[PDB]
Enzyme design. Sequence first.
Site, short mmCIF file in Angstrom:
data_model
loop_
_atom_site.label_atom_id
_atom_site.label_comp_id
_atom_site.label_asym_id
_atom_site.label_seq_id
_atom_site.Cartn_x
_atom_site.Cartn_y
_atom_site.Cartn_z
N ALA A 156 2.26 30.16 -3.22
CA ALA A 156 1.27 29.96 -2.16
C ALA A 156 1.77 29.10 -1.01
O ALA A 156 1.31 29.25 0.12
CB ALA A 156 -0.01 29.34 -2.74
N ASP A 211 29.98 33.11 37.39
CA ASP A 211 31.10 33.41 38.28
C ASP A 211 30.46 33.93 39.57
O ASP A 211 29.35 34.48 39.54
CB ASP A 211 31.99 34.49 37.67
CG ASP A 211 32.85 33.96 36.52
OD1 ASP A 211 33.71 33.10 36.80
OD2 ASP A 211 32.66 34.38 35.36
N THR A 263 31.98 36.11 42.50
CA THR A 263 32.32 37.51 42.74
C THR A 263 31.77 38.53 41.74
O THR A 263 32.13 38.54 40.56
CB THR A 263 33.83 37.73 42.81
OG1 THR A 263 34.40 36.80 43.73
CG2 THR A 263 34.12 39.11 43.30
N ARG A 297 50.48 33.18 45.29
CA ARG A 297 49.67 31.97 45.48
C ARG A 297 50.58 30.86 46.00
O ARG A 297 50.14 29.88 46.60
CB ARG A 297 49.07 31.53 44.15
CG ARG A 297 48.04 32.46 43.54
CD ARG A 297 47.76 32.01 42.13
NE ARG A 297 47.76 30.54 42.08
CZ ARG A 297 47.85 29.81 40.97
NH1 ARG A 297 47.96 30.39 39.79
NH2 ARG A 297 47.85 28.49 41.05
N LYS A 335 50.17 38.49 56.74
CA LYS A 335 48.73 38.38 56.48
C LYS A 335 48.52 37.39 55.32
O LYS A 335 49.20 37.50 54.29
CB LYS A 335 48.20 39.76 56.08
CG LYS A 335 46.79 39.78 55.57
CD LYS A 335 46.41 41.15 54.98
CE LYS A 335 47.12 41.41 53.64
NZ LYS A 335 46.52 42.56 52.89
N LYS A 341 36.67 26.19 32.06
CA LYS A 341 35.39 26.68 31.59
C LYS A 341 35.14 26.13 30.19
O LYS A 341 34.04 25.69 29.91
CB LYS A 341 35.35 28.21 31.60
CG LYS A 341 35.06 28.82 32.99
CD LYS A 341 34.97 30.32 32.86
CE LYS A 341 34.51 31.02 34.12
NZ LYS A 341 34.51 32.49 33.92
N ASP A 373 35.00 37.12 31.98
CA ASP A 373 35.57 38.14 31.11
C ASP A 373 37.10 38.16 30.98
O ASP A 373 37.79 37.33 31.55
CB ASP A 373 35.02 39.53 31.45
CG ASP A 373 35.76 40.20 32.56
OD1 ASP A 373 36.05 39.50 33.55
OD2 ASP A 373 36.03 41.42 32.46
N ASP A 394 38.86 34.18 29.29
CA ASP A 394 37.52 33.61 29.19
C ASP A 394 36.95 33.61 27.78
O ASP A 394 36.06 32.81 27.48
CB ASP A 394 36.57 34.35 30.12
CG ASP A 394 36.58 33.78 31.54
OD1 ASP A 394 37.38 32.85 31.83
OD2 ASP A 394 35.77 34.26 32.37
#
Length: 994
Positions: free
Chosen positions: A305, A351, A353, A489, A515, A684, A703, A707
């Site tokens: 019960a 994120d 973008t 980079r 560029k 992260k 992702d 990540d």
Amino acid sequence: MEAAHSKSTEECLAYFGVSETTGLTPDQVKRHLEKYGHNELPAEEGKSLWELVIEQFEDLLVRILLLAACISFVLAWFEEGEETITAFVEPFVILLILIANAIVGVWQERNAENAIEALKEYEPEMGKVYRADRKSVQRIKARDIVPGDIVEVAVGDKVPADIRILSIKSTTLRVDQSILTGESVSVIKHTEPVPDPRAVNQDKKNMLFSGTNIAAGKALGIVATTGVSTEIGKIRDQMAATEQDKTPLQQKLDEFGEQLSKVISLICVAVWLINIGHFNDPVHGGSWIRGAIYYFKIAVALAVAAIPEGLPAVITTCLALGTRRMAKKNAIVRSLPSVETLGCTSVICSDKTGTLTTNQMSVCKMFIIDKVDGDFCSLNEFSITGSTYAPEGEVLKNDKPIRSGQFDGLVELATICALCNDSSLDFNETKGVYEKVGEATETALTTLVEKMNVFNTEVRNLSKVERANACNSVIRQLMKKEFTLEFSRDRKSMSVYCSPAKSSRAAVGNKMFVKGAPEGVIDRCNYVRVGTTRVPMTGPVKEKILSVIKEWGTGRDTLRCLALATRDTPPKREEMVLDDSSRFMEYETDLTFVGVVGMLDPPRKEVMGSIQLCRDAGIRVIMITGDNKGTAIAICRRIGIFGENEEVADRAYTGREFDDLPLAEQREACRRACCFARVEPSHKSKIVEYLQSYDEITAMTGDGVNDAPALKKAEIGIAMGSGTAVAKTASEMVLADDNFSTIVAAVEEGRAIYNNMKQFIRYLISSNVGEVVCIFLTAALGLPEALIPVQLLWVNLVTDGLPATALGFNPPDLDIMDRPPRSPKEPLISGWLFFRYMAIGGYVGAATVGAAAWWFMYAEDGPGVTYHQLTHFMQCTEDHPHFEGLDCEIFEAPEPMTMALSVLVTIEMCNALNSLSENQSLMRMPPWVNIWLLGSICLSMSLHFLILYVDPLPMIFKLKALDLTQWLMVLKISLPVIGLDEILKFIARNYLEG
Ligand SMILES: CC(=O)C1=C(O)N2[C@@H](C1=O)[C@@H]1c3c[nH]c4cccc(c34)C[C@@H]1C2(C)C
């Protein structure tokens, strides 16, 4: 050898003592295999179906119920009667429920592909090596490749280990590093060493990572590391070390069983203590057996019960239903328990973008030098229309349309953008729209020249597909693209070496078109273009150009800016070594500044809203972007993460500024920051850890395998529907649309679910208190048992089962998102809900016991014994209170129990409607507000009749149909509960709001 990227090709060959020509030898092979193991990730030994189940009976309550089934078996056997037809149903059904429930519990691990396992999808079966025992290449099991041998990879291959490239056989080697990041854009490798010993994989341009693919080319390398020593393997290990905490709910329930497990036991002790007086009974009388069997009987009933046997099935069904409901809103939740913990979400790091933005790059501003003269200077700013990759739009100055052609600097600007490119447009047939082919930043550029059309090329003739690359193809004529030095980079720029098309033996005329990011490019300019003329880049004009860029990137425009330059007198083709990107900047110098283009990656049309929805819900939103700190803060305000003028001097950090602060300040920064720009590979994860230290349930997007770790850590790891496979398998929820708002929609939806779950939880547990009061009463007053386990079970499982499930569709609160995140410390049923739910039970108790004692005393068809003290005796060893009485087996008659049971079943259908709302009357919240609820109630009551008439049941359950008069007595002692709760509800709305 894990620092191979920083060592020279010769150094690596030396370290392992191997020849590039023959490779390791079979003696070196064995010796290497014995030192480094085989090239594969460690296999998983999943928990055993029996181990798992066994661990489910590791729970305290499951034990207390198990024991009972044991106490039930002993009694089921040490019994003498003709009810033998159903003398084992009790200990049988009890044990059964225990099974069905454990399985349901274990139905949280059967199917759930995890990252640590999905990582095998990336290690291939075969690899190609050159060993001393042969001249030609042999293709062995990748499993058997070891550090130090020589391997070969060509287009189509999946790299079988972490390989240091020795030499490139093709013209250029291209690798698809998608499984690590997500980006399809293949990368260009080289054989020249990378100085930095602690370079990040992104700069290790001479390494090939296990699990990747050769996009284009053929190369030869020496294997650096293998197995769990590679980049993927190192990620695979982090995963394995990540402990997975129990959801704030599970934790709360697990502790409730402890709280419940103690009481249950305490009551089996207060029962005994109360019947201590029996210690004062003649040894030569009564029975030392009827007592032990009695204390043992009401103990089992007592446990049965107190425990809500239907809870597990109810929670599991609600969460299943809850999952499908999220799916309709494009939130694929992989873990059931997650539909719960989702609502406790207190922090969302997203994120930018593609999640917070559409990731549809578009050029909407540009400028060239108008003129320079003395300290006087003037630029020529523009504006472009059309945000789609479609070549439909126009250029204009001062909101008034102009023709680009009429400006020389705009012709050059256009030439570069088209020549120093690598992408192109493509009109889709089915979709009927132009699709980008390559980098989004470039395509935008391609789309720009089609709108600018500096050569007035007649294109309105051409069809859709034709004019796509129309204006581009034209510029591609004026020049021949000899070669292009890839972007790095390192110098954050790129260029293409060109020579005029119409030219036979012309040794002068070549041009280099640069560029890249403004700061770098602009500092390598000694000249500034003005039309077709050129003049020295003076200090002033430099601050002028730089300032307009600061504006376009830090203002409300939040534009990504590219400075465009051209080397007029480029170095001679012969003097350039197109193999050492470490020389590319050098080649890109003594440049002339041509112009600046500013593009936009537009925020999703529903982010600002969802972000506001978050400020209300008291949910912090942390953005993680690639933009610079300047444009990052600027974008944060644009969507609301920050207030246009609010100070953010300590609420925004760049991966670099973060690594500078000491481990203490980093933790302090994670509790206040809202914007991370240019973050490191391991951030992260640190962010998640520093957030968890502040007891915050975190949602973390991202992702690719880089990540995976972070996602594994966060309480709610979020992957994109378009993300890698491993990302998904490591996440708790997938965004079928990659939209930030879907996240928010899920949090709200989780908030509903938890509230409804908190509703039916109280519903049921209250039902248990009423039953415990019922037993303890029939025991403290020596009355005959009113309700038995077999009955109670069917109740707490079915009768009460459906309605509890029904409550799953209870309408959500309108202010569901306008109140802060539920602290994972806040208890379930406590305080007001204790007293409130205590009284309901206490009434339910008395009401059932009373309904029993009633029939027994004030009923017609019932052997009236008003004040005949059912308590004073049951022994019937005197038969005095019934002289000429030859029947005492009516103290176990089915009628009174059928009265007790009917009461409970009716009172619970009632409380089910009282459970539509925590503090709202049925006046404001009618019963029909929840149709499913009314449905289950009927399905239950009717089912109540099913066990009262269908021959087997009524007897098995020990019940007998009730008379229309008796039933009139149930409603009389049942329906009133609705008024009692309305009262308690009233007491809450008015005298409990302050
Ligand atoms: C609040 C609290 O701690 C708990 C509970 O309240 N419950 C579960 C439980 O752990 C128990 C349980 C786990 N697995 C099964 C299978 C069959 C029956 C039960 C269980 C009984 C316990 C239940 C569902 C009442």
